[PDB]
Amino acid sequence: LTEEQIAEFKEAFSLFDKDGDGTITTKELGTVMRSLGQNPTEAELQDMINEVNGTIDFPEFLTMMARKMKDTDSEEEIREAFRVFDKDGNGYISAAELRHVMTNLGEKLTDEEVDEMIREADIDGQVNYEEFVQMMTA
C-alpha cells in the first residue's frame, strides 16, 4: 500500500460505487479486480466474498488487496535485498559473508540469531537463500 496504490484502490471502488454509503454489491469483485487488472480463480474470489448482509464494502477490501500486493512485494523484495550483495548472481552466499550480511541494523541481535542461521542453513561453503526462505518465513 502506497500513496498511488491506495489512491487507485479508492478510485476504483468509488467509481464502481454508486449510492454513496461505501458498499458496492456482491458480484462486483471480479469486475473491480479486472479493472485493477487481476483475474484469479473463482475459489479465491468466493473466499474473498465470504470473508466480507450481502454488501461488499471498503475495509477488508483494502486489507485483502494489501495482502495480494504484499505477496508480490515479498517475492520482489526478497529477490532484490539479496541482489544487493552476492555480485556474481547465483543466490549462493558464503557462510562467513552470511555472518556479515545477517548482523544488520534494525534487529542487530547477538550470536543467538546467527547461531540459529549457521546451525541449519545448508552449508557445503555456499548457501542458497531458498533454505533461508523455507526456514525463516516459517
Binding site: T41, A43, E44, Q46, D47
Partner: protein, 455 residues
C-alpha cells in the same frame, strides 16, 4: 474452495502415507475406479496418492495385483489422449517401476428387463427352480421353526404363507416368480446360453416340509463366480435405482450409501450374490454348466513400443512430453529388468530412426537419458545390429551437420557401444571417416567418446 480442497488433499495423502497396505489395496480399488476419468485435476491428485502408495509398497507388496496391472494398463491408455500431464507422467515412472517390481455423483446402469422372452426348454426347468427356491426359503424359516396359522402374527410363531405346492395357484406363485423371471431375462438377454448336460438330483416343525438339497456346500469356478458377480452388481444397481426413484418421490435429497460399488461391506454384496447364485448353485446341483455363451506389463510393453514408434513418427510437430513419458516408462522398465524384449528393442531402434534427420527440443534433451536407459536395458537383458549401425550412422549424419548435437550423437554412439561391448566394423570405418571429416574443425568430446567406445 481452493485451499480447502488442497487441505483435504494433504489430509488424504498423509493418512494414506501413514498407512498396512491392505486398506491401501481397498482404497487402490477406488483409485482404479477413478483412474478412468484422468483425461479432474484432483482426481489426478487421487492418482498421485495412489502413486505414493505404489512407491511405498513397491518393495514388499510390489487379490489386487491383477487390479494394479489393470490400473496401470488403463492409466497408460487414458494418459495417451492429449504441466498436469507432465505431473502424471513423472508420477508414472515410479508406478511403472513398481508394476515392474510386481513383474519381477454415482450413476448405476441397469438393463431393460422385459423386452426379450424366454425359450420354453428352460421353462421346463423353471417349474423345479422356483419350487426349490421357495423350498429353501421355507427351510430357512424351519431353521426358526415356523408353524402355519390364520391371523398374520409375527410373535405367535405364525406364517400365513406356509401352504403346500398343491395349494399354490398361478398368481400365488407369480410373486416369487417375478424376480426369478426378471433375473433369468437379464441373464439370457445379453447372449448367454445354458445347454444340455448330464442328469442331476435336527428336528422339523408344522406346515410345509422341504427336504431341500443343501445349498451350504456348493461352489462354482472363478469365471463362473465372475459372471455371478456381474449379475450381483446388476442386481444392486437395480436396487439402487429402486431406492433413488423413491428418495426423491417425497421431495428431498439422497441417502449417503449412494457410493461407488467397491466401498460397501460384505453382506450387501453377498445378498445379491446369493440371489444371483440361487440359480447357479442349483444348476450345479442338477449339473448344468453355467457358460458364457506380472506378465501383463510385459505384454503391454509391445503395444507401448508400437505407440512409441507412432509418437516418434508424429511427436515433434507439443507431443514432446508424450514422448518423454514413454521414455521414462522405458527407463522404469529398464530398472525392472525374452523375444518380446527383442521386439521392443527393434521398435526402440525404429523409434530412434523415425526422427533421425530432424534431431522438439526437450524431447531431444530427454532422448539422451532415454538412450542411456536403453543402454541400461541392454545391460539388463538377431543379426540386425549391422543395419541398425547404418541407421545410427544416418542419425549421426543428420545430427552432425548441426549446437552440440554432433557431440550428443557421439555420446549416443558411445552409449550404444557401451551397451554392445560390455557383453563387423564397416560402421566403425564410417565413424572413423566422420572423425576425419569433422575433427580438425564438441569435437574433443567426440574424440574422448571414439577413443574409448571403439570396442
Amino acid at each position: 474452495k481452493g485451499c480447502s480442497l488442497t487441505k483435504a488433499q494433504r489430509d488424504s495423502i498423509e493418512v494414506c502415507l501413514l498407512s498396512r497396505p491392505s486398506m491401501m489395496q481397498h482404497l487402490l480399488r477406488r483409485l482404479v475406479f477413478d483412474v478412468p476419468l484422468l483425461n479432474k485435476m484432483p482426481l489426478k491428485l487421487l492418482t498421485n496418492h495412489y502413486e505414493r502408495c505404489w512407491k511405498y509398497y513397491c518393495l514388499p507388496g510390489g487379490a489386487s495385483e491383477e487390479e494394479l496391472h489393470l490400473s496401470r494398463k488403463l492409466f497408460w491408455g487414458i494418459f495417451d489422449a492429449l504441466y498436469e500431464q507432465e505431473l502424471f507422467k513423472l508420477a508414472l515412472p515410479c508406478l511403472s517401476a513398481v508394476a515392474g517390481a510386481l513383474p519381477p455423483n454415482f450413476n448405476p446402469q441397469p438393463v431393460d428387463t422385459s423386452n426379450i422372452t424366454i425359450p420354453e426348454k428352460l421353462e421346463y426347468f423353471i417349474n423345479k427352480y422356483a419350487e426349490h427356491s421357495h423350498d429353501k426359503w421355507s427351510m430357512d424359516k424351519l431353521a426358526n421353526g415356523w408353524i402355519y396359522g390364520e391371523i398374520y402374527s409375527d410373535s405367535s410363531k405364525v406364517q400365513p404363507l406356509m401352504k403346500p405346492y398343491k395349494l399354490l395357484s398361478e398368481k400365488e406363485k407369480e410373486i416369487y416368480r417375478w424376480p426369478i423371471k426378471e433375473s433369468l431375462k437379464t441373464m439370457l438377454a445379453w447372449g448367454w446360453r445354458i445347454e444340455r448336460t448330464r442328469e442331476g438330483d435336527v428336528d422339523a416343525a408344522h406346515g410345509y416340509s422341504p427336504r431341500a438339497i443343501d445349498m451350504s456346500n456348493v461352489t462354482l469356478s472363478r469365471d463362473l463366480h465372475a459372471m455371478a458377480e456381474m449379475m450381483a452388481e446388476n442386481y444392486h444397481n437395480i436396487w439402487a435405482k429402486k431406492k433413488k426413484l423413491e428418495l426423491e418421490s417425497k421431495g428431498g435429497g439422497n441417502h449417503p450409501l449412494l457410493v461407488p460399488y467397491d466401498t460397501l461391506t460384505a453382506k450387501e454384496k453377498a445378498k445379491d450374490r446369493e440371489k444371483a447364485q440361487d440359480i447357479l448353485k442349483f444348476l450345479q446341483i442338477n449339473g448344468y454348466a453355467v457358460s458364457r455363451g506380472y506378465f501383463l506389463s510385459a505384454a503391454s510393453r509391445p503395444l507401448c513400443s508400437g505407440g512409441h514408434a507412432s509418437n516418434k513418427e508424429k511427436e515433434m510437430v507439443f507431443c514432446k512430453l508424450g514422448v518423454l513419458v514413454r521414455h521414462r516408462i522405458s527407463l522404469f522398465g529398464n530398472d525392472a529388468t525374452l523375444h518380446i524384449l527383442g521386439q521392443t528393442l527393434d521398435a526402440r531402434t525404429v523409434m530412434k530412426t523415425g526422427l533421425e534427420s530432424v534431431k522438439f527440443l526437450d524431447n531431444a534433451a530427454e532422448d539422451l537419458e532415454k538412450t542411456m536407459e536403453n543402454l541400461k536395458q541392454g545391460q539388463f537383458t538377431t543379426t540386425v545390429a549391422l543395419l541398425p549401425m547404418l541407421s545410427s550412422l544416418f542419425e549421426h549424419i543428420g545430427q552432425h551437420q548441426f549446437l552440440e548435437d554432433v557431440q550428443v550423437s557421439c555420446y549416443r554412439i558411445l552409449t550404444s557401444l557401451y551397451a554392445l561391448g560390455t557383453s563387423v566394423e564397416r560402421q566403425r570405418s564410417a565413424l572413423g571417416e566422420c572423425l576425419a571429416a569433422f575433427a580438425g574443425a564438441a569435437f574433443l568430446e567426440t574424440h574422448l567418446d571414439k577413443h574409448n567406445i571403439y570396442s
